[PDB]
Amino acid sequence: IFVKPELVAEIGVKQLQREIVLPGLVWTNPLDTITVRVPAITTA
């Protein structure tokens, strides 16, 4: 009986995760509150 150490390794075993695709496809605005003006349309 020979006492032996233990081995903990890591070879290409990655936990499955999501993919960042949705960010960058939306209108992002920097910065209390932000108000956006709506231009008017007249009639004839």
């Binding site: 903990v8 290409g12 075993v13 936990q15 499955l16 995760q17 999501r18 993919e19």
Partner: protein, 327 residues
């Protein structure tokens, strides 16, 4: 976590991480032994390398292939896909989207299919008709090769069941092989290797038994890579669901009034299902049938045997009755 602004009630509420692990160990010792009974060895065997070493190497290689074979299906598979015999590419698309749902990487996805799967792919209209396939060469008609399908490589292997296909990521199964160390108190052997892995050939002279005994051995270990919650989502199994079965050969007499006949049953797809089929005799006194289908004639006359097969899709078991005329 998501926090509501300008309303401190759930202050901080931090999180933590726990790193997981799984163990891989060697647990099988593949060995092949041959006693030579020297008095036979002096006259029987002619070429030691031809009729001894080569059969041992082939046996070890095929044993290793079988070891891979039962490990392939020896995993907690969730779904069977249930490929329709007529239309097959929707099953492959479903398997691909199932793999995508589990966020399995698309690169390095090995797919192995049986002979029946390849035959079903060849029989499929979407791969024969050039207008429905795209390629004007029409390899389905000029040859039997199918080619690339759903971003996968088709490899034929008869080790697995013919009506079964497996699509797994590269990091899905862990196989470890260890070459045994040649002892320092035995006759020197060799370093024969089959399919990459090296084996140990140890031969010793048994003076007590007046013989020579040789052993080809190698250590091996298997592991199935699964998630922390016990969800094997790194591989998918596709099954060719059947719709009808029939006993091969049609009507038959048997062999004689007191003979035996190993009955065989095949599905509509063309796969052997004898092992997973039950057999019943409505005239058991006239004709006796075994569990495996070995019908034995005990009394001359006419009888019937009904073979039942549970469908992979589930539901009622398909039944087929064949008459027998024992002489």
């Amino acid at each position: 976590n998501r926090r509501d602004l300008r309303d401190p009630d759930r202050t901080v509420i931090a999180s933590e991480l726990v790193e997981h692990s799984f163990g891989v160990t060697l647990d099988k010792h593949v060995y092949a032994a041959l006693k030579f009974t020297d008095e036979q060895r002096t006259l029987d065997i002619r070429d030691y390398t031809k009729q001894v070493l080569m059969p041992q190497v082939s046996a070890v290689a095929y044993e290793l292939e079988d070891y891979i074979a039962e490990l392939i299906e020896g995993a907690p598979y969730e779904e069977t896909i249930l490929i329709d015999p007529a239309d097959t590419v929707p099953a492959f698309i479903t398997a691909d989207q199932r793999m995508g749902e589990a966020n399995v990487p698309t690169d390095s996805r090995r797919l192995v299919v049986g002979s029946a799967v390849a035959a079903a792919l060849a029989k499929d209209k979407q791969f024969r008709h050039a207008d429905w396939s795209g390629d004007q060469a029409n390899a389905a008609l000029r040859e039997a090769h199918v080619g690339r399908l759903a971003g996968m490589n088709v490899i034929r292997s008869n080790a697995i069941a013919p009506d079964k296909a497996y699509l797994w990521h590269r990091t899905a199964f862990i196989l470890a092989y260890r070459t045994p160390v040649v002892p320092e108190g035995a006759k020197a052997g060799a370093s024969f290797s089959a399919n990459g892995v090296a084996l140990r050939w140890l031969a010793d002279y048994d003076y007590s038994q007046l013989g020579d005994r040789t052993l080809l051995d190698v250590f091996t270990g298997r592991k199935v890579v699964t998630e922390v919650d016990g969800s094997f989502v790194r591989a998918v199994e596709l099954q060719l669901q059947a719709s009808s079965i029939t006993i091969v050969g049609g009507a038959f007499a048997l062999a004689t009034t007191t003979g035996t006949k190993q009955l065989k049953v095949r599905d509509d797809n063309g796969t052997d299902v004898t092992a997973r089929c039950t057999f019943a005799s409505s005239a058991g006194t006239k004709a006796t049938v075994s569990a495996a289908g070995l019908v034995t004639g005990v009394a001359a006359g006419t009888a019937d045997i009904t073979a039942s097969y549970v469908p992979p899709q589930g539901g009622t078991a398909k039944t087929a009755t064949v008459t027998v005329t024992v002489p």
